[PDB]
Nucleic acid binder design. Structure first.
Ligand SMILES: Nc1ncnc2c1ncn2[C@@H]1O[C@H](COP(=O)(O)O)[C@@H](O)[C@H]1O
Length: 645
DNA sequence: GCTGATGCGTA
DNA sequence: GTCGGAC
DNA sequence: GTCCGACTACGCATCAGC
């Protein structure tokens, strides 16, 4: 019986310890039980062991069910470049849960906010899970198809249809299934296992129990002969095949059926980095100072690049002339930028037959010949733009080359790839230029360069080694670059003193306390606190608890007459304005929602904070003594990017 | 058809 | 996007 | 250090209720 299933069981046996006969379909309750054991523990190694154990049975008995099981555990709907989204929000999901169970909405919405988890509410209600005799059990592939069903429906009257499908599952759910369907739909599975741990579990699972094996499979534990040391080394090198493959083709739709009929050793042969197929980009680790750079890099030579404030654009040029473009999430952004396809001609030498570029698309005002802020870039249409429409021009700032003229430049040092980029590509000012770089190790030069980038409408510096551990092999270390941001540096930075005027109930890791707060500045001339932004990162678990107790004393039934939030999300608890917190941010923005300082820099819009974080309590300060909307308008005006307008 | 609410992808 | 926790 | 999951602003695209 599946409810008995224990994929966490000591010395776990794929065929004997399963809960479905071979060539049957994997049952969803198996997937739910594997989930229960994964969330029950906190070590990633144990989690990987359990998910491996389920994945091995799935390979021995129902291999067609492997792809959907993996998707179910990532909570993905498919390849990222295909663009699926469920289009179901918390409120619809709560209507779905309520109807399915027979309960009043208000009651359901209440308990969900209270427990901080919709899955818990969907589980523990089972009326009409009475009158109608139980529907057939739920299958892993079936649930994953109903998910793809929901995400597929669009247009007028689709919500009602999306709900019916969800009610379908909730009625077929038994045991712990409703908990995880509800969690998945809400995009909050919170197992404590995600992409990296799935890959680990996959490669271990096919390593221990390889596919394409005549049932009953000859070998079910290819690890038994080896000693405990020899095992761990073999596991690690197996996982790295998969990881670097996935990193070049993060697409289970391609990778998986290839694994099922060619084994893991042969995967790099059939799935290699290739234009038109987006690959995981290289990521930056935050570095809190020039001193920490030399700690992290020690003896390796490195370069310093301008960090541009636009959005990543991974430009693909295939042999045959076709041109595609992808976001850092692997989204297809090709239709987004007609203007960039037209200008592919202008950027390469005639000898260049195919490339993958790593660049930053940055809004550009040609009238004035300089960079506009991020808020401008985002006003451009998405979807399917036709070139006549384009309002906000973008300029490309290239800083890496991944694949040239048929050959894959991944294993090559940066020093190499930057040369190749500089050789075969052509700067056209205000349209496609290279990243301002300074090769150096002198701390004074590095600091002057930092202050210079910010002067030139940028966020600070990127930092990349040139030859030591300086490839593009994301699977070795994904966060292989450093970001030296201006606001990372103690003493340097916009910090504001803000008043807590509201609290929001936490979810998940924050259930039972407050997960975020509403913050305001003081406006002297209208004798009013005005909401500036929400705050939800920067406190320790202890600090966040102290805040729950100290601020519960001050919960108010309704807001003070002098509190002004306008468009912002109404808090769950209004608070007596007393508490003053020190708050740091990266930028200040013109807000469509917040009333802080409205009319002082824009007749219509107020000012907000970009990337706000809690620093500490201002025990010595009073709401009167808070940063003032006047000061918020001063801070905004002096912003480097802003003075250049 | 108009309007307000909101999902979601970008940072 | 930034940030803290468990390992 | 690595991986994971709490949380932030903003604006285009979408749909329900009228
Ligand atoms: N010189 C540069 N090198 C790499 N990435 C850059 C550079 N300038 C801007 N970026 C962007 O900065 C992002 C990394 O910022 P974070 O906050 O992880 C990348 O994904 C790029 O879009």
């Amino acid at each position: 019986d599946p409810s008995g299933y224990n994929p966490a069981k000591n010395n776990y046996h794929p065929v004997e310890d399963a809960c479905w006969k071979p060539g049957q379909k994997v049952p969803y309750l198996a997937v739910a039980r594997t989930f229960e054991k994964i969330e029950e523990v906190s070590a990633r190694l144990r989690m990987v062991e359990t998910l491996s154990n389920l994945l091995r049975s799935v390979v021995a008995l129902s291999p067609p069910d492997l792809l959907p099981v993996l998707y179910l555990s990532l909570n993905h709907l498919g390849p990222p470049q295909q663009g699926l989204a469920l289009g179901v929000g918390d409120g619809v999901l709560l209507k779905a849960v309520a109807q399915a169970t027979g309960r009043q909405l208000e009651s359901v919405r209440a308990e969900a906010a209270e427990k901080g988890d919709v899955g818990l509410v969907a589980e523990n209600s089972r009326s009409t899970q009475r009158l109608m005799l139980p529907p057939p059990p739920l299958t892993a592939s079936g649930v994953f198809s109903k998910f793809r069903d929901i995400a597929r429906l669009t247009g007028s009257a689709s919500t009602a249809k999306k709900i019916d499908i969800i009610k379908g599952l909730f009625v077929a759910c038994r045991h712990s299934e409703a908990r995880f369907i509800a969690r998945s739909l809400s995009g909050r599975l919170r197992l404590g296992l995600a992409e990296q741990s799935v890959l680990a579990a996959l490669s271990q699972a096919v390593s221990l129990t390889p596919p394409g094996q005549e049932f009953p499979p000859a070998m079910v534990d290819a690890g038994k002969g080896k000693t405990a040391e020899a095992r761990k080394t073999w596991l690690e090198e197996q996982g790295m095949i998969l990881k670097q493959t996935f990193c070049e083709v993060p697409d289970l739709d391609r990778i998986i059926p290839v694994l099922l009929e060619h084994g893991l050793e042969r995967l790099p042969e059939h799935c290699k980095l290739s234009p038109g197929i987006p690959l995981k980009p290289m990521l930056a680790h935050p570095t809190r100072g020039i001193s920490e750079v030399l700690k992290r890099f020690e003896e390796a030579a490195f370069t310093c690049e301008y960090k541009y404030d636009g959005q990543r654009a991974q430009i693909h040029a295939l042999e045959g002339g076709e041109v595609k473009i992808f976001s850092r999430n692997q989204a297809d952004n090709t239709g987004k930028y007609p203007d960039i396809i037209s200008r592919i001609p202008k950027i390469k030498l005639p000898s260049v037959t195919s490339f993958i570029l790593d660049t930053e698309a940055v809004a550009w005002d040609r009238e004035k010949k300089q960079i506009q802020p991020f808020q401008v870039l985002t006003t451009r249409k998405r979807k399917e733009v036709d070139a006549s429409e384009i309002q906000v021009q973008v300029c490309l700032y290239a800083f890496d080359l991944i694949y040239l003229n048929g050959e894959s430049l991944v294993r090559e040092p940066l020093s190499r790839r930057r040369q190749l980029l500089r050789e075969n590509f052509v700067e056209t000012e205000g349209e496609f230029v290279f990243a301002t770089s300074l090769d150096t190790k002198d701390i004074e030069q590095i600091a002057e360069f930092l202050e210079q980038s910010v002067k030139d409408s940028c966020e600070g510096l990127m930092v990349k080694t040139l030859d030591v551990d300086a490839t593009y092999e994301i699977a070795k270390r994904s966060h292989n670059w450093l970001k030296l941001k201006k606001d990372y540096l103690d003493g340097v930075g916009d910090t504001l003193d803000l008043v807590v005027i509201g609290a929001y109930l936490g979810r998940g890791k924050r259930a039972g306390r407050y997960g975020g707060f509403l913050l305001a500045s003081y406006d002297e001339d209208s004798e009013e606190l005005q909401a500036i932004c929400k705050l939800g990162t920067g406190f320790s678990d202890e600090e966040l608890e102290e805040h729950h107790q100290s601020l519960k004393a001050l919960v108010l039934p309704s807001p003070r007459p002098y509190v002004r939030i306008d468009g912002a999300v109404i808090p769950d608890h209004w608070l007596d304005p007393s508490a003053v917190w020190e708050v740091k941010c990266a930028d200040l923005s013109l807000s469509p929602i917040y009333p802080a300082a409205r009319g002082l820099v824009d007749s219509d819009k107020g000012i907000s904070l970009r990337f706000p974080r809690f620093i500490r309590v201002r025990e010595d300060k009073q709401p009167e003594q808070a940063t003032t909307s006047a000061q918020v308008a001063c801070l905004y005006r002096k912003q480097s990017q802003i003075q250049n307008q």
